[PDB]
Design a protein around this ligand. Structure first.
Ligand SMILES: CCCCCCCCCCCCCCCCCC(=O)OC[C@H](COP(=O)([O-])OCC(O)COP(=O)([O-])OC[C@@H](COC(=O)CCCCCCCCCCCCCCCCC)OC(=O)CCCCCCCCCCCCCCCCC)OC(=O)CCCCCCCCCCCCCCCCC
Lengths: 60, 99, 119, 61
């Protein structure tokens, strides 16, 4: 069991992008799409800090 | 005056640790290349100097040894006697001492 | 006169004399020993000796000057204010007429001109 | 609108004065305590009057 677990840990290290590279590129642009969507609708005080996240449901 | 008094010209940072007193870090201390990266860098300089920088070396070494003398009149005697009659300003330009 | 909120502690230490006193920043911990309620802005606490002055006014407004001001938190504020403006007046004059006594001054240990080295 | 009072500004022209008010107004952040307001803050509500340390009557007496 230690050998099998250590082997599949390597194959998922060397390989893995054959099956998981799409879900990482998907979450990469998703991580940027909601970030840009946050800057559009969010209260920023005189310094760049969102001090009112609970202003509305869309802000939270 | 306190016997353990020093004046330091560069910034230092002291540790805020109980029972100990030392300099834990230097502000804006940048780490250069490692000892291995510097070694590879120097090997490339030494290799080119070994392959392509050995011809005409005996003449330049004589000019360098003459210019380590105390007085200028002895340098001119060294250049004329040992370096085949070289000129003071001409040899100083070769060695890179001329502005 | 110090024209800022902060000063280098080493610039008020002597170079050729034993250092038996420092010029420390305001003791903000004494501000929390006042039992009553008061309004203090953080923009006034760093300038030298002024925090102790404002603490004295707050104590002399809450209490008076008789049998109520005589408590450890109020007397230390007045003593610190009087001592602070005395030390700063002495250090200020010494900085003005004896600048060579302090660390960091170019005259504490003068570097010679190149014409004095005989090269 | 801007309310006038005994304490006056320190500008020669009116354009300099109006520019100072615009700079100060553009930095105002309203903090109201009533719900259904675009600027609502239950906690961290700012005061609109500055406190001044003065010698009281017990002080001078
Ligand atoms: C050990 C586990 C078991 C025990 C668990 C115990 C958990 C407790 C530990 C605390 C957890 C850490 C989270 C603390 C958040 C800070 C909250 C706070 O201080 O209030 C400020 C907060 C914001 O003040 P504001 O009025 O909006 O500011 C307006 C200014 O204009 C603002 O502009 P400004 O220019 O004046 O700037 C002021 C400056 C001031 O700066 C500061 O003072 C620093 C503040 C510290 C926060 C900064 C780090 C924020 C990190 C964000 C990530 C947090 C995620 C949550 C972590 C939870 C961990 C699981 O900036 C801020 O205001 C900071 C913004 C604060 C927003 C907080 C983020 C919202 C939380 C999102 C989740 C909401 C869950 C609530 C569920 C409640 C259910 C009852 O006030 C409120 O949120 C009011 C509450 C919400 C209103 C709805 C009514 C709810 C009533 C509930 C009553 C019951 C209470 C709970 C009872 C529980 C027992 C039954």
């Amino acid at each position: 069991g230690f050998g099998c677990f250590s082997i599949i840990n390597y194959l998922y290290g060397r390989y893995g992008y054959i099956i998981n590279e799409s879900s990482q590129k998907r979450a990469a642009q998703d991580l940027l799409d909601n970030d840009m969507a946050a800057d559009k609708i969010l209260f920023k005080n005189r310094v760049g800090a969102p001090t009112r996240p609970l202003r509305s449901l869309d802000d939270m | 005056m306190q016997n353990t008094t020093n004046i330091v010209h560069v910034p230092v940072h002291m540790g805020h640790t109980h029972y100990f007193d030392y300099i834990d870090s230097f502000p804006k201390l940048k780490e250069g290349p490692t000892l291995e990266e510097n070694h590879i860098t120097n090997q490339k300089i030494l290799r080119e100097q070994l392959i392509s920088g050995q011809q005409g070396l005996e003449q330049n070494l004589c000019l360098r040894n003459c210019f380590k003398l105390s007085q200028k009149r002895y340098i001119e005697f060294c250049l004329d006697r040992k370096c085949g009659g070289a000129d003071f300003q001409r040899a100083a330009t070769i060695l890179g001492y001329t502005k | 006169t110090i024209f800022a909120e902060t000063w280098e502690a080493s610039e008020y230490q002597y170079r050729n004399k034993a250092n038996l006193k420092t010029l420390p920043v305001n003791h903000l911990g004494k501000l929390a020993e006042l039992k009553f309620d008061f309004v203090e802005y953080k923009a006034h606490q760093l300038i030298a000796c002024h925090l102790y002055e404002r603490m004295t006014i707050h104590c002399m407004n809450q209490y008076g000057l008789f049998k109520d001001f005589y408590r450890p938190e109020c007397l230390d504020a007045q003593y610190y204010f009087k001592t602070c403006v005395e030390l700063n007046a002495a250090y200020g004059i010494q900085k003005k007429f004896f600048p060579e006594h302090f660390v960091g001054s170019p005259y504490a240990r003068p570097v010679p001109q190149f014409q004095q080295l005989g090269l | 609108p801007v309310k006038e009072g005994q304490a006056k500004l320190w500008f020669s022209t009116k354009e300099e004065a109006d520019a100072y008010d615009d700079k100060m107004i553009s930095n105002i952040e309203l903090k109201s305590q009533d719900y259904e307001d675009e600027n609502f803050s239950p906690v961290f509500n700012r005061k609109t009057q500055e406190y001044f340390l003065e010698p009281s009557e017990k002080f001078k007496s």
